[PDB]
Amino acid sequence: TLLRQGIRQLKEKVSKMEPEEMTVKEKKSIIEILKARIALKKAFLKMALSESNDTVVKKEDVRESPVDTFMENAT
Amino acid sequence: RTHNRQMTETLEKYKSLDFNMEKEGDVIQQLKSSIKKP
Amino acid sequence: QLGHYIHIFVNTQPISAFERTLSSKRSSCEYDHFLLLVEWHHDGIVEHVPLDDHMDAQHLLLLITQ
Numbered sequence: 001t002l003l004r005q006g007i008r009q010l011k012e013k014v015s016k017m018e019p020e021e022m023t024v025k026e027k028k029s030i031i032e033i034l035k036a037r038i039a040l041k042k043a044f045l046k047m048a049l050s051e052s053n054d055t056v057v058k059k060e061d062v063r064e065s066p067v068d069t070f071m072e073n074a075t
Numbered sequence: 076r077t078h079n080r081q082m083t084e085t086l087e088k089y090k091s092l093d094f095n096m097e098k099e100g101d102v103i104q105q106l107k108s109s110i111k112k113p
Numbered sequence: 114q115l116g117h118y119i120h121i122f123v124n125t126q127p128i129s130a131f132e133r134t135l136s137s138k139r140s141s142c143e144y145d146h147f148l149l150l151v152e153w154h155h156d157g158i159v160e161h162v163p164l165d166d167h168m169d170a171q172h173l174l175l176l177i178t179q
Contacts, residue, residue, distance in 0.1 A: 046129060056134050063138075069109045074089040 003038055006031055119177065122150035153177060 010028045014021055047053050086093045095101070125146035136142050151173070153160045162176060 046133070048130070052130055052134075059134060065112060066109060068112055070089075073091055073095070073108075075091075 001038075003035055003042070006035065117155045119154065119173070120150065120152040122152075124148040124150050 010031065013024045013028065015024065047056070096104075126148060127143070127146060131140075132142065149164050151160075151162050151164065153162065162173075
């Protein structure tokens with residue numbers, strides 16, 4: 001959510017080789033502070049990631065195969 | 076009288092060809108009707 | 114050698130990876146549960162080496178000495 005594109009919006013905000021960047025980054029870090037708590041909202045972990053999710057989708061891919069078998073026998 | 080036609084049709088329904096297995100013929104065909112599918 | 118020892122135990126380790134991805138079928142939720150611990154001490158490794166019958170009291174000791 002906000003953690004995603006918030007990085008995208010903070011990312012372009014860097015400007016000038018001069019150390020004025022902090023004046024921008026102070027606006028960033030506060031959001032990041034919120035992110036530190038926004039991340040708390042997302043303190044969950046069901047599935048790991050890939051490839052386990054891919055294994056799930058493939059698991060249905062075999063599990064959807066019978067549907068074109070016995071159901072065909074129904075017809 | 077109730078059991079009759081009901082048993083017949085239910086054989087003809089999802090079972091359709093209940094003889095389709097043909098005993099041993101229903102062995103590898105169970106893959107041919109399924110594992111062969113792609 | 115200035116000792117060294119193995120322990121072996123049954124254990125229970127549920128995992129989510131099957132808990133929801135499976136079931137709803139001929140697929141058990143909880144078993145639950147059973148395993149075969151094989152500790153490999155005085156190494157700090159405590160590695161859980163695979164077991165697969167046939168297995169004997171010897172072969173463990175052999176792999177371990179290896």
